[PDB]
Amino acid sequence: GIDFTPHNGTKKIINTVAEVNKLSDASGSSIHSHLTNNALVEIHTANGRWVRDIYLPQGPDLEGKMVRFVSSAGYSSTVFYGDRKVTLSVGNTLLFKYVNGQWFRSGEL
């Protein structure tokens, strides 16, 4: 019964090469930084704008925060979230929310 609605309309879009390139950070540091001032980060991978591995951050200040992925990249990516991982393939959208110290993926159950 998770409510996948952002706290407000502050939304960061990551849709350029330089920003996508930061997403391979094991700590998810750039996503973490963008979530300090935004309720939601939405990442758009595309052809020419892709990385293989993407890590969601952990930490207290992520409470209620959300991350959306939209892939238009032919290459697949792996999104790591806590002890779990999921494949982000071309033409797919993924959505996550952090509740009481854990990421929940929409549609996981």
- Record the resolution, in angstroms: 1.6
Nearest to 27 by CA among 58, 61, 50: 58
> What determination technique applies here?
X-ray
Q: Which two tokens stand for residue 65?
A: 């925060």
Count the domains in the chain: 1
Of 28, 34, 45, nearest to 10 by C-alpha is 34
Question: What burial letters (b/e) apply to 92-107, b meaning 16+ CB within 10 Å?
Answer: eebbbbbeeeebbbee
In angstroms, the CA 39 to CA 64 distance is 8
Domain that holds residue 99: 1-109
CATH of the domain at 46: 2.60.120.1230
